[PDB]
Structure formats: C-alpha cells, structure tokens
C-alpha cells in the first residue's frame, strides 16, 4: 500500500515520457518537410 | 540585414576585453556593423496572410467535377504506369523510386473514390 | 535459497513430464499423484504470475487418458472421477486471474472446450470465450490453433458456416511446423473441408493431396464427390462405408447436416436458364430423391434462394431467371470493403515489425 | 458436470424448494459456474424479494458469477448485501478478489467526496456497508502489526479518522521508535499529497503526536513548523521549552529554524514572542545575524583562493564588446563569495580602467558579492559610492545599490526603508542618463531588500518608475515588484502588471513585467492557472517566456503531473526560439523535490532538435542536480560540451560546474578533463565569444567562495528548502536581457561545514569529531568508501560526500544535545563541567559586538 506508492513513481515517469514522444513525432515530421525544401 | 556605422552616444558599449572597443571608436569613427533582426506584426495582418490559401469552394469543387468527367481515360493511363512498375521491380530483383511511383498511383485512386 | 527452490520446482516439472509418453508406469495410476502435487503445495507457493512454471502437459496428459478408454475404461462407472477433474480444472480457470496468468488461462480453455464438444452442451462454450478475451502477449501459436478449432466446431453445430470458416483458415496458419503438422493438422483439416462443403462447395482436391496424410484424404474425397455431384444415393452409400471415420473425428452430426445440401446441389448443377423450363424434367429427377415431395422440394428451393422462379401447376410450367451472367452491382461493394480490410491488416503487420 | 438438478428447482416456487437448492449451489459456484451463469436472471429475482429473506444467500452466489463475467461494480454491491456471509477473514480466491475491488471503489468515491466535503465517512452520503468493510480492513492491518499497510490505504481513501486512530493506538512508550514512524509518514504525505487541505491536517496531527510524548525529537518538531507555515505550532512548542529549559537545547531549536524556515514566518513569530516574554539570547538568534557571522568566520579561515589563474586568463586575449568583461567580473564574485577578499581587484587595477559604463555597474555589484556575510561592514565599505556621499559618476553608484541588496538580503527590514527614499527621488527626476542607471540599480536593490514580504508602499514607489517610460529603470522596477510580492500577493498586483505589459511599446519593460508575474506566483498552485493561460495566449515572446516560469514557481517543490505536462507541451509546440528554452529550464523547478527524475525527463529533450532546447536542459540539470552531485547528469552533459553550437557549449561548461562544485577525483573522475577544457578555450585565439564566457565563468563556479560553498536549493539545517535559493536560481539563468543578473547566485551559495557552538556562552569552540574524511577514498579540490576512523578539528571543509558520515566525540567534554542530524548545519553542544575554557576560538561576532 506503501509499496504501491513506490511503483506509482516509476509509472508516472513513463506516462509523462510516453505522451511527450507523440507530440514530438508530429512536430518532427512538419520540420522534416520544410527543411527538405530548404536544402 | 540591418546596418549602422559607428555613431556612438549609446553605441559606446558596442563595436579579457574592453581596451579594444574604446580604441576601435577612438581610431576610426564609421565602420560598419551588422544589427539584429526581429519581426513584430499585427493579428489582422497575420489572419490576412493565412486566408490567402467560397471562390475557394467553387474552385476545389470545379476540379473535382471535371476530374470525374475525364476519369475513364485517367483510369487507363494509370494501369499502364502500374504495369510498367511491376515489370521494373522484377528485373530489379532503385527501391525508393519504385515505391514513390506506386504511392502516387494509390493516392490518386483514393482521391478519385472520394470525389463522387 | 532462491536458486535452490526454483531448481526443485523445475526439476519436478521435468520429472513428471519425462514420466509420461515414454517412461510412465501407467497413465491412469499416476493421475492421483499429479492432482496431489497441484492442489496443495504448488498453487499455494505461486504468487499468481506462473506461465512457464506450470504447463499444458500435466493437465493434457491426465485428461487424455480419461478419454482414451482402452488403457482405462473407467475405475468407477458412476463417473465420479472424470466429473471431478472437469470441476477441478473449471475451479482453476477462476484462479488464473483476469490480469495475470494469461497463457495458463488459455490452456484451461482448450481442455474444458473439448470435453463439452465430445459429449455435452456446446452453448456452455459461450461464457468461456467471453472470459478468454483480455490482453494477451503470452499465448502460443499451438494453443491458438487449438482455440480456433474448438471454436469453429461449436459454431458449425450452431449453424454459422462463415464464422467457423474464417477461424478454421486462420488455425492452419502459424502453428503448423513438424510437431503440429502431425495428428492435430489432420483433425483441423477434416473440419476445414467439411465447413467449405456446408457453406457452399469445397475447392479442388489437388492442393490437399500433398499437404496431408493420404490415408485420411481417400475417405474425405469420397465424401466431397457425393455432395458435389449431388446424388442422394451416392451420399448414403458413402456415409455407410466411412462410419468408422465419422466416429473417430466426432462428426456423426454431418450426416444430419450435409443431407439437405446434397439434395440442393443436385438441383443446382442443372442450368434452368431458359424463359420457361418444363416441370417434367425436374419431377423426373426428384422422384429417386423424394417419393412424396416433388412439388414441395421445387417450392423449397425457390424460397431458399437457389433459383428465382414462378411455377403454375395448372399450366405445369416453371418460369425462371438466367443462372449464368449473375453477379452485378454491389457484389463489387462487398468485395471492395472486404479486400481493403485485408490490405490494412497486412500494412499494420509491416509497421509492427 | 451439471448444475441442472439444482438450477431447475429455482424455477419452482415454495421457499423450502428454493432453500434446498441454494445451499447446494453455494459450495460449488466457483466450480460449476458455466452452467450457473445462464440461470442468472432467476437468481437476481430471489434477491429482489424481501418477503423471502434468504435474499442475502442468493446475492452471495450471484456475486461469484458476476466476478467471473467481469462485472466487478455489480459483484461488489451484491457482496455487500450478502452481509453475514461476506467474511473477509476466510481469504479464498473469491473473497480476496472482491475485497480488492471494494477498497478500489471506496478510494474512487473518496477522491470525489473529499473535494465536496470533509466529514463524509461519518455520514450516510456514502455507503455504511462500504465503510464498515473499510474499518475491518484497517483492523486487519493493525492486527498484523504493519503500520505501513494500515496508513497506505487510509491515505488513499481520504479519511483523517483512520490515520489518527492508527498512529495513536500504536504509539508506544519507545520514544525512538515513534519518531522513526512519524518521520517515515512526513516524507510520504509531503511528496504524494498535493491536496493542501488533506495533507495539512496529517502534518498538524503528527506534531500533536510527538507532543504527547515526555521526550521527543526536537529537530522533527522544527521541520513541521516549517512545512505547514504555521505560527501556532511553533508557539506551543516554545512554552513547552520554558518548562524543560536546557539552554543548549533551546538554542539548538532556534538555530535549526532560522536557516530553514521562511523569512516571514520567523519575523511574525519573533513579534509574538517579544510580546509574551522570551529570552533575548534566543530573539537575537531568530534574526539570523549570529548565524551569518558563524559562516563568515568559517569562510575566513577556510579560503582557498587562486587568484593567479584569473590573471593568466585575463592576459590571454582582449577583444570586442561587453560580454567578456561580464565574464571576469562574475568569476571574481563567485571566487571571493563570503570570504571577503578584494585581493584580485586591490592589486590589479588597469583592467578596470578599460571598462566603460555598463562594465562599471557590473564590476561594482561584484563588490557586493565579496562583501556578503558582513552584517555591518556591507554599507560602510560601499559608503563613498552609496548616495549622499557622491562619487564621480553614477554608473559606479548603480551597482552599489544592487550589491547592497545582495549582502543585506534576509535582514532587509531596514534596507527597504533606506532605498525607497532613493526610489521617491528618482521617480521625480528622469531625463538624464546618469539618474536612469542610478535608479535601475536602486530598483534591483529594493526588490532584493523587500523580497517576499508584501510591502505595498514599495509597490507604489517602484510603480511610478513605470509611467516615466524608461527602458533602463523600468526593467529593474518591474522585476523588483515581482520579488517583493512573491508569495500570495495582491489580486491587484497581478492584474495591473499583466495589463501594463500588453500596453507597453518598450521591450525591456515587457520582459521585466513578464518575469515579474512568474515570481509573484510561488506556491500558489492551481490558483495561478488563469494567468498562465493569458501569458501563453499572448503572441508576445516575452510574456510566453515568463509564462513557463509561472508554472515552475507555483508548482515548485512537490510537483504535479499536469504541471510538467503543460511545460512539455510549451517546449514542443512553440517554434519561437526563446520560449523553448524557458520551458525546458522551467521543468527543473517542478522536479527540484527529487533530482533523480530530471535526466530521464530530459533524455528525449537532449536529442531533441533546437539548440535552445539542449542548452536549456543543461541549465536545468545544473539547478536540479547540484544537491549531492549526480553522476547520471554529468554523463548527459558530456556530449553537450562538444556541441558545435557556441552557446550549448557555454551552458554545458557552467552546468557541469554547478553539479561538480566542491568535488574531486575518486568522486568524479571526469572533473580533470573538464578542467582542461575550461582552460583550453580561453587561451585559444580561435574560439567564438559565447563559448568563452562559459569557460571563464565555469571555473568561477567550481572554485567558488574559496572552495567552501556549494549550490543547493536548500539551506541545510534540517534540509528543508528556503525561499532565497530558489528565486536566486531563476534570476541567475538570465544573462541575456541585461548582462549582470549572474550575481543572484550569491543567494544560493550555501557553506557546507559542521559548526559546533558551546552553549554556555553561545559562541563557537573547537573539538575533534569522528568522521570519515580519509585521503584513502576522498580528497578536497586542489590544483566513495569508508573503513578507517578519522578525526579533525571543528570548522573545517566538509563535502556533500563526507557530510554523510559525521559523528561526534564526547571526550573533549562537549556532548551534543541532538547528536548528529544527518546533515551540515549549526548545532549546539553542551559543555558538561562549565568552570573553565577547554576551547573557545575567536569569532567575528566578538569583533563586531
């Protein structure tokens, strides 16, 4: 129950990184399109 | 770019240092330097720039209509291109090119089914 | 201590395993002892996470012998022994959690499903399947095929030819290697052939010729021809011959099910394509099939959707539609939707890997 | 395997017929379940009758079936209604599973219900049945003798009554054990619970539990007055301290609180204390003037200055613009911080002669850095350059008023009242260049003096500076208002200031007010969320940049998922360059509670494109990990030093040093290579300008305050955070909008040292301390492992690494009252036999008084 809390900390880091990656793939893709046009 | 010569009266902190620039404005007044750029703009200007890209409605639709009239022919030429593509890949057994050719054909079909 | 305890528990799994198939002392005799190790002093030790530290083999071997009935042929005729095993395994399925114990959950489903199929209700199936449906990452290819096979057989009894078709075709993909390309492949193949016959008609017999045991194939050929050529007389006489086959496979039910279809297939071959087709030719054929239901059968056919027709019995004529250049608009709609689905799934499989 | 004989009987009527089946079915539900599921509508039908009262037994069978299906909410309900047949002590696969789900359901309900009410578990708003079960589940955990299970559930399910009762019952008299328990719970409530109303109640209750004991561990009592920011707890503690008077103890308590606790809390507590009667020895301690002098003594003796290195670096090359003067000025300040050596500057005077006006203001405010930790000589030394005693120019004067705020931050009750007269003067006068600069420093300087305490008079004086519409004075003024009204602040202050930013055509002012609002938010949590949106919704870069720090500060300390998430958002989706850096720097602050999370968070950002992102995460690491040094951070920084972009190189060098302050080989191998680099860039004539600031300044941090100071986000005496360190660090990341702002690092430099106090006279002595400072696994920085006893005198250099292992010796005739407290910080030992000196060294408090 105290245990559970310890496991939540490790879980919480993963959820935050996992959601952040999604946002990143999407920005990277637009930037990839424009930059190719720039070269 | 944005430039100004030496002109001082505030640029006296401008072109481990500080001997240099005092002597630089004291040996020579008027020598170029670049300046920084920023763009500040206004939200109505901003919205106008984006609404460039009902006349709009009329145009997209117009092409859609005329595409559908002509599709009987558009059908035939893209099988021929496709027939070619399949054959090339056989010899081939480059890859990017063969893929792109197939990708264009698929994209076009979806847009065509969608149109009606 | 950790290392020592695991080592023992693994050691026991090997020891029981080696001690069956090729080193047993009689399989029936041994069951008690297997039951004894499981129930106290084993489930009790596990923290509900076992997938590999218990195995299908123990329950498979014990149950296999109770259904053999020639190295057993009971030990109580009250049927206490086998009922109790069915209960104990059913109880285990509760014990395999709905978030953990996932491979072990599925093995239980296969065994329980078999026993109901042989001799029981197969609407008892319905609960097990719903329970089974949860995220899985650990259920193996062999187990999947076994799943599909029990599932098809049930749906076949219930009269869904289509569901059982997709599942049966899926079954014979993935699992078959060299240890699943053996007796299991033979059971599966029997059902897969049958299913095609009932829904419609079976593909050519050429493919099946080199992909299965020949001994099986000759009886299967005999059965398919009778249905396809459509003669009733062929079908009974054939059914009579391969009684032994249908019994081993647990497919005595085919005899009831296939019969309607045979009589239907015998009208279907005959291409009633002209504007009127005379009644007499169709009565003439039917007389051999049917002694009192010549008019009923032609009617039955029309209601089914075998032929679109008109009959007058005053004028004694059949007027019909052209059974040749059918397949028009919206037949592509069905194909177009279904074939795209098949394409999306394969693209998905590319992305994953 | 058939349930059919039994199932068939349910479809018949007569109560007898129903009874005969029920009990047969009950035993074997789990076993026979497939068949039993189809008869489920009928079994529900038994339940819905209340003339046939074996409803509860139907219900129990039905629950089993409902579980197996996967309708858990439904099973739980029927399981409750079963009543005397639901027994949780039987513990089967059935009973265990529905019990789990039951706690789950109360917890869910208890979240929603806590936000609405604060009494709900005593009422009929929620299910008594659920409650009853919750109360037994609790008994079960306390019966099993694990308190960490009992508390864990009670916490999650928002009940105060269970937490209270559990600690109470299990509170044993021993004293030692209770204290361990209360501290394990203090960590847990603070770092997990962001609901203030719940947490505050657990915090306040834990004080009352330590209070009920005859002896109690006073350091933990001190911790909690800090945590709750509550005057009441502190007062009751101090009247208790009157009954039990030991002079060594009473002094120990006051030195812990003065460093750790917030400035305002201490002040009002002294205002109340005076009025009831307290001891004047103590009242003096609580100002924090003695404490600051004890550190001044420490830094005077333990200086390890290396002024040749800076001379050699200054002679390396001489070029264009004001950035590189800022670099040497800043590295001087950091080096001489708290030791009070103007040696470098006193000897070498020609480079000062090369300096223009902005460089003079920067160099004079470095004098403020040196003369920090003088409580009377701060003003005096600076006095010919301080207003009313006119010097030759005002550019000189402007960094004096700024620096005067630096020294005198945290004693600025007076300093505000002095500078505000300057503020009234030069609101009045504006038109010449000399008065604008004079007031810009006065305004940075006033904001330091009034820090964190709403002085609304100061708010008005600075505010008139805005209207005069000067880019020089106004930038300072705007920031000053933010520093002053840090904490809760005016509703007015926020609104007035935000609006005035949107109107302004002046750049420096917008930026100044942007940062100004971020500061006003400090612990205000979700109540600042509104201004955040406003700030981000601006198409102004400056307010967006500031906007990120408003979440950094408001959610600083214990974090929040939404808060971190909103910042991940800002960094990604804002392609404007400045904004991306502010958002990544901001991440550091939410996550200052545990520095360990930071390398993971920013791993993605470190490979993320844009050099503003990569640089920003360098600074963030710098801030976050500097508490003990983190090996996993240094590794992340390594690539970033050898980045090709000039400014990412700079940040990495600076960031490295902030983690690697007061460290050596065998603790961090890497520091030799790092040191070579810092040197290599300066000496070279081929590098770019931005990189070169980074190298000079990096050196300045590593070797800062005579090798005796560290960058921590806390002042160590209980390890709990102090205001100044945080604020100071947000201000320090800024160099870019006005060059000297570096200087704020002066507030976040903490000395790490064990300082004993002989309580019989309240003055420092020297005694040996058994310690592990051996040169067999450690070194100090000069140009791991423990097994052997080692001893040394008091008032000595003590690493973070060495700090872990302190003990004390009781045979110099001094014995500690609280022993060791695990960490660096002022103590007080009791001298057993007070009749003579057995050590009584000099202190600089006896050279002032």
CSV table of N, CA and C in Angstrom, one decimal, chain D residues 297-402:
chain,number,residue,atom,x,y,z
D,297,UNK,N,33.1,33.7,9.8
D,297,UNK,CA,34.3,33.1,10.4
D,297,UNK,C,34.8,31.8,9.6
D,298,UNK,N,33.8,30.9,9.2
D,298,UNK,CA,34.2,29.7,8.6
D,298,UNK,C,34.9,30.0,7.2
D,299,UNK,N,34.3,30.8,6.4
D,299,UNK,CA,34.9,31.2,5.1
D,299,UNK,C,36.1,32.0,5.3
D,300,UNK,N,36.4,32.8,6.4
D,300,UNK,CA,37.7,33.5,6.5
D,300,UNK,C,38.8,32.6,6.7
D,301,UNK,N,38.6,31.5,7.5
D,301,UNK,CA,39.7,30.6,7.8
D,301,UNK,C,39.9,29.6,6.6
D,302,UNK,N,38.9,29.2,6.0
D,302,UNK,CA,38.9,28.0,5.1
D,302,UNK,C,39.1,28.4,3.7
D,303,UNK,N,39.3,29.7,3.3
D,303,UNK,CA,39.6,30.2,2.0
D,303,UNK,C,40.7,29.5,1.2
D,304,UNK,N,40.4,29.2,-0.1
D,304,UNK,CA,41.4,28.6,-0.9
D,304,UNK,C,41.4,29.2,-2.3
D,305,UNK,N,41.8,30.5,-2.3
D,305,UNK,CA,41.7,31.4,-3.3
D,305,UNK,C,42.9,31.2,-4.3
D,306,UNK,N,42.7,31.5,-5.6
D,306,UNK,CA,43.7,31.1,-6.6
D,306,UNK,C,43.7,32.1,-7.6
D,307,UNK,N,44.2,33.3,-7.2
D,307,UNK,CA,44.0,34.5,-7.9
D,307,UNK,C,44.9,34.5,-9.1
D,308,UNK,N,46.0,33.8,-9.2
D,308,UNK,CA,46.9,33.8,-10.4
D,308,UNK,C,46.3,33.3,-11.6
D,309,UNK,N,45.3,32.3,-11.4
D,309,UNK,CA,44.6,31.7,-12.5
D,309,UNK,C,43.8,32.8,-13.3
D,310,UNK,N,43.1,33.7,-12.6
D,310,UNK,CA,42.3,34.7,-13.2
D,310,UNK,C,43.1,35.7,-14.0
D,311,UNK,N,44.3,36.1,-13.4
D,311,UNK,CA,45.3,37.0,-14.0
D,311,UNK,C,45.8,36.5,-15.3
D,312,UNK,N,46.1,35.2,-15.4
D,312,UNK,CA,46.6,34.5,-16.5
D,312,UNK,C,45.5,34.4,-17.6
D,313,UNK,N,44.2,34.1,-17.2
D,313,UNK,CA,43.1,34.1,-18.1
D,313,UNK,C,42.8,35.5,-18.6
D,314,UNK,N,42.9,36.6,-17.9
D,314,UNK,CA,42.6,37.9,-18.4
D,314,UNK,C,43.6,38.4,-19.4
D,315,UNK,N,44.9,38.0,-19.3
D,315,UNK,CA,46.0,38.3,-20.2
D,315,UNK,C,46.0,37.4,-21.5
D,316,UNK,N,45.2,36.3,-21.5
D,316,UNK,CA,45.1,35.5,-22.6
D,316,UNK,C,44.8,36.2,-23.9
D,317,UNK,N,43.7,37.0,-23.9
D,317,UNK,CA,43.3,37.8,-25.1
D,317,UNK,C,42.4,39.0,-24.8
D,318,UNK,N,42.3,40.0,-25.7
D,318,UNK,CA,41.5,41.1,-25.5
D,318,UNK,C,40.8,41.5,-26.8
D,319,UNK,N,39.4,41.5,-26.8
D,319,UNK,CA,38.6,41.8,-28.0
D,319,UNK,C,37.4,42.7,-27.7
D,320,UNK,N,36.4,42.6,-28.6
D,320,UNK,CA,35.3,43.4,-28.8
D,320,UNK,C,34.1,43.2,-27.8
D,321,UNK,N,33.3,44.2,-27.6
D,321,UNK,CA,32.0,44.1,-26.8
D,321,UNK,C,32.1,43.8,-25.2
D,322,UNK,N,31.0,44.1,-24.5
D,322,UNK,CA,30.8,43.9,-23.1
D,322,UNK,C,30.6,42.6,-22.5
D,323,UNK,N,30.3,41.5,-23.2
D,323,UNK,CA,30.1,40.1,-22.7
D,323,UNK,C,31.4,39.6,-21.9
D,324,UNK,N,32.6,39.8,-22.4
D,324,UNK,CA,33.8,39.2,-21.7
D,324,UNK,C,34.2,39.9,-20.5
D,325,UNK,N,33.9,41.2,-20.3
D,325,UNK,CA,34.1,41.8,-19.0
D,325,UNK,C,33.2,41.3,-18.0
D,326,UNK,N,31.9,41.0,-18.3
D,326,UNK,CA,30.9,40.4,-17.5
D,326,UNK,C,31.3,39.1,-17.0
D,327,UNK,N,32.0,38.3,-17.9
D,327,UNK,CA,32.6,37.0,-17.6
D,327,UNK,C,33.6,37.0,-16.4
D,328,UNK,N,34.7,37.9,-16.5
D,328,UNK,CA,35.7,38.0,-15.5
D,328,UNK,C,35.1,38.6,-14.2
D,329,UNK,N,34.2,39.6,-14.3
D,329,UNK,CA,33.5,40.2,-13.2
D,329,UNK,C,32.7,39.2,-12.4
D,330,UNK,N,32.0,38.3,-13.1
D,330,UNK,CA,31.2,37.3,-12.5
D,330,UNK,C,32.1,36.2,-11.9
D,331,UNK,N,33.2,35.8,-12.6
D,331,UNK,CA,34.0,34.8,-12.0
D,331,UNK,C,34.7,35.2,-10.7
D,332,UNK,N,35.1,36.5,-10.6
D,332,UNK,CA,35.6,37.2,-9.4
D,332,UNK,C,34.7,37.0,-8.3
D,333,UNK,N,33.4,37.5,-8.5
D,333,UNK,CA,32.4,37.5,-7.4
D,333,UNK,C,32.2,36.2,-6.8
D,334,UNK,N,32.1,35.1,-7.7
D,334,UNK,CA,31.8,33.7,-7.2
D,334,UNK,C,33.0,33.2,-6.4
D,335,UNK,N,34.3,33.4,-6.8
D,335,UNK,CA,35.5,33.1,-6.2
D,335,UNK,C,35.7,33.7,-4.8
D,336,UNK,N,35.4,35.0,-4.6
D,336,UNK,CA,35.5,35.7,-3.4
D,336,UNK,C,34.3,35.8,-2.5
D,337,UNK,N,33.3,35.0,-2.8
D,337,UNK,CA,32.0,35.0,-2.2
D,337,UNK,C,32.1,34.5,-0.8
D,338,UNK,N,31.7,35.4,0.2
D,338,UNK,CA,31.6,35.2,1.6
D,338,UNK,C,33.0,35.3,2.3
D,339,UNK,N,34.2,35.2,1.6
D,339,UNK,CA,35.5,35.1,2.3
D,339,UNK,C,35.9,36.4,2.6
D,340,UNK,N,35.5,37.4,1.7
D,340,UNK,CA,35.9,38.9,1.9
D,340,UNK,C,37.3,39.2,1.6
D,341,UNK,N,37.7,38.9,0.3
D,341,UNK,CA,39.0,39.2,-0.3
D,341,UNK,C,38.6,39.9,-1.6
D,342,UNK,N,39.0,41.2,-1.6
D,342,UNK,CA,39.1,42.1,-2.7
D,342,UNK,C,40.4,42.0,-3.2
D,343,UNK,N,41.3,41.0,-2.9
D,343,UNK,CA,42.7,40.9,-3.3
D,343,UNK,C,42.9,41.0,-4.7
D,344,UNK,N,42.1,40.4,-5.6
D,344,UNK,CA,42.4,40.4,-7.0
D,344,UNK,C,42.3,41.8,-7.5
D,345,UNK,N,41.2,42.5,-7.2
D,345,UNK,CA,40.8,43.8,-7.6
D,345,UNK,C,41.7,44.9,-7.0
D,346,UNK,N,42.1,44.7,-5.7
D,346,UNK,CA,43.0,45.6,-5.0
D,346,UNK,C,44.4,45.7,-5.6
D,347,UNK,N,45.0,44.6,-6.1
D,347,UNK,CA,46.2,44.5,-6.7
D,347,UNK,C,46.2,45.0,-8.1
D,348,UNK,N,45.3,44.4,-8.9
D,348,UNK,CA,45.3,44.6,-10.3
D,348,UNK,C,44.2,45.5,-10.6
D,349,UNK,N,44.6,46.7,-11.1
D,349,UNK,CA,43.7,47.9,-11.2
D,349,UNK,C,43.6,48.2,-12.7
D,350,UNK,N,44.5,48.0,-13.7
D,350,UNK,CA,44.4,48.6,-15.1
D,350,UNK,C,43.2,48.1,-15.9
D,351,UNK,N,42.8,46.9,-15.7
D,351,UNK,CA,41.7,46.3,-16.5
D,351,UNK,C,40.4,47.0,-16.2
D,352,UNK,N,40.2,47.5,-15.0
D,352,UNK,CA,39.2,48.4,-14.6
D,352,UNK,C,39.1,49.7,-15.3
D,353,UNK,N,40.3,50.2,-15.6
D,353,UNK,CA,40.5,51.4,-16.4
D,353,UNK,C,40.0,51.3,-17.8
D,354,UNK,N,39.9,50.1,-18.5
D,354,UNK,CA,39.5,49.8,-19.8
D,354,UNK,C,38.0,49.8,-19.9
D,355,UNK,N,37.3,49.4,-18.8
D,355,UNK,CA,35.9,49.3,-18.6
D,355,UNK,C,35.2,50.7,-18.9
D,356,UNK,N,34.1,50.5,-19.7
D,356,UNK,CA,33.0,51.5,-19.9
D,356,UNK,C,32.0,51.4,-18.8
D,357,UNK,N,30.9,52.2,-19.0
D,357,UNK,CA,29.8,52.4,-18.0
D,357,UNK,C,29.0,51.2,-17.6
D,358,UNK,N,28.6,50.2,-18.5
D,358,UNK,CA,27.8,49.1,-18.2
D,358,UNK,C,28.7,48.1,-17.5
D,359,UNK,N,30.0,48.0,-17.8
D,359,UNK,CA,31.0,47.2,-17.2
D,359,UNK,C,31.3,47.7,-15.8
D,360,UNK,N,31.2,49.0,-15.5
D,360,UNK,CA,31.5,49.5,-14.2
D,360,UNK,C,30.4,49.1,-13.2
D,361,UNK,N,29.1,49.1,-13.6
D,361,UNK,CA,28.0,48.7,-12.9
D,361,UNK,C,28.0,47.2,-12.6
D,362,UNK,N,28.5,46.4,-13.6
D,362,UNK,CA,28.7,45.0,-13.4
D,362,UNK,C,29.9,44.8,-12.4
D,363,UNK,N,31.1,45.4,-12.5
D,363,UNK,CA,32.2,45.2,-11.5
D,363,UNK,C,31.8,45.6,-10.1
D,364,UNK,N,31.1,46.8,-9.8
D,364,UNK,CA,30.8,47.3,-8.5
D,364,UNK,C,29.8,46.3,-7.8
D,365,UNK,N,28.8,45.7,-8.5
D,365,UNK,CA,27.9,44.7,-7.9
D,365,UNK,C,28.6,43.4,-7.7
D,366,UNK,N,29.9,43.2,-8.3
D,366,UNK,CA,30.7,42.1,-7.8
D,366,UNK,C,31.3,42.3,-6.4
D,367,UNK,N,31.5,43.6,-6.0
D,367,UNK,CA,32.0,44.0,-4.7
D,367,UNK,C,31.0,43.6,-3.7
D,368,UNK,N,29.7,43.6,-4.0
D,368,UNK,CA,28.6,43.2,-3.2
D,368,UNK,C,28.6,41.7,-3.0
D,369,UNK,N,29.2,41.0,-3.9
D,369,UNK,CA,29.3,39.5,-3.8
D,369,UNK,C,30.3,39.2,-2.8
D,370,UNK,N,31.6,39.9,-2.8
D,370,UNK,CA,32.6,39.8,-1.9
D,370,UNK,C,32.2,40.1,-0.5
D,371,UNK,N,31.4,41.2,-0.3
D,371,UNK,CA,31.4,41.8,1.0
D,371,UNK,C,30.1,41.2,1.6
D,372,UNK,N,29.5,40.1,1.0
D,372,UNK,CA,28.4,39.4,1.5
D,372,UNK,C,28.9,38.7,2.8
D,373,UNK,N,28.0,38.6,3.8
D,373,UNK,CA,28.3,38.0,5.0
D,373,UNK,C,29.0,38.9,5.9
D,374,UNK,N,28.9,40.3,5.8
D,374,UNK,CA,29.2,41.3,6.7
D,374,UNK,C,27.9,41.8,7.0
D,375,UNK,N,27.6,41.9,8.3
D,375,UNK,CA,26.4,42.5,8.7
D,375,UNK,C,26.4,43.9,9.2
D,376,UNK,N,27.6,44.6,9.1
D,376,UNK,CA,27.7,45.9,9.5
D,376,UNK,C,28.7,46.6,8.6
D,377,UNK,N,29.5,45.8,7.9
D,377,UNK,CA,30.6,46.5,7.1
D,377,UNK,C,30.2,46.5,5.7
D,378,UNK,N,29.0,46.0,5.4
D,378,UNK,CA,28.5,45.9,4.0
D,378,UNK,C,28.3,47.3,3.4
D,379,UNK,N,27.6,48.1,4.1
D,379,UNK,CA,27.2,49.5,3.8
D,379,UNK,C,28.4,50.4,3.8
D,380,UNK,N,29.2,50.2,4.8
D,380,UNK,CA,30.3,51.1,5.1
D,380,UNK,C,31.4,51.1,4.1
D,381,UNK,N,31.8,49.9,3.6
D,381,UNK,CA,32.8,49.8,2.6
D,381,UNK,C,32.4,50.5,1.3
D,382,UNK,N,31.1,50.3,1.0
D,382,UNK,CA,30.5,50.7,-0.2
D,382,UNK,C,30.1,52.2,-0.1
D,383,UNK,N,30.1,52.8,1.1
D,383,UNK,CA,29.6,54.1,1.5
D,383,UNK,C,30.1,55.2,0.6
D,384,UNK,N,31.3,55.4,0.0
D,384,UNK,CA,31.6,56.6,-0.8
D,384,UNK,C,31.0,56.5,-2.2
D,385,UNK,N,30.3,55.5,-2.4
D,385,UNK,CA,29.8,55.1,-3.8
D,385,UNK,C,28.3,55.0,-3.6
D,386,UNK,N,27.8,55.1,-2.4
D,386,UNK,CA,26.4,55.0,-2.0
D,386,UNK,C,25.9,56.4,-1.9
D,387,UNK,N,24.7,56.8,-2.3
D,387,UNK,CA,24.0,58.1,-2.3
D,387,UNK,C,24.2,58.8,-1.0
D,388,UNK,N,24.3,60.2,-1.2
D,388,UNK,CA,24.5,61.1,-0.1
D,388,UNK,C,26.0,61.3,0.1
D,389,UNK,N,26.9,60.6,-0.7
D,389,UNK,CA,28.3,60.8,-0.4
D,389,UNK,C,28.8,60.5,-1.8
D,390,UNK,N,28.2,61.3,-2.8
D,390,UNK,CA,28.6,61.4,-4.2
D,390,UNK,C,30.1,61.0,-4.6
D,391,UNK,N,30.1,60.2,-5.5
D,391,UNK,CA,31.3,59.8,-6.2
D,391,UNK,C,31.4,60.6,-7.4
D,392,UNK,N,32.1,60.0,-8.5
D,392,UNK,CA,32.4,60.9,-9.7
D,392,UNK,C,31.4,60.5,-10.7
D,393,UNK,N,30.7,59.3,-10.6
D,393,UNK,CA,29.8,59.0,-11.6
D,393,UNK,C,28.9,58.0,-11.1
D,394,UNK,N,27.7,57.9,-11.6
D,394,UNK,CA,26.5,57.2,-11.2
D,394,UNK,C,26.4,55.8,-11.6
D,395,UNK,N,27.2,55.4,-12.6
D,395,UNK,CA,27.3,54.1,-13.2
D,395,UNK,C,28.0,53.2,-12.2
D,396,UNK,N,28.9,53.8,-11.4
D,396,UNK,CA,29.6,53.3,-10.2
D,396,UNK,C,28.5,53.1,-9.1
D,397,UNK,N,27.6,54.0,-8.9
D,397,UNK,CA,26.7,54.1,-7.8
D,397,UNK,C,25.6,53.0,-7.9
D,398,UNK,N,25.3,52.6,-9.2
D,398,UNK,CA,24.1,51.9,-9.6
D,398,UNK,C,24.4,50.5,-9.2
D,399,UNK,N,25.6,49.9,-9.4
D,399,UNK,CA,25.8,48.5,-9.0
D,399,UNK,C,26.1,48.5,-7.4
D,400,UNK,N,26.2,49.7,-6.7
D,400,UNK,CA,26.3,49.7,-5.3
D,400,UNK,C,25.0,49.4,-4.7
D,401,UNK,N,23.9,50.0,-5.1
D,401,UNK,CA,22.5,49.8,-4.6
D,401,UNK,C,22.1,48.4,-4.8
D,402,UNK,N,22.6,47.8,-5.9
D,402,UNK,CA,22.2,46.4,-6.2
D,402,UNK,C,22.9,45.5,-5.3
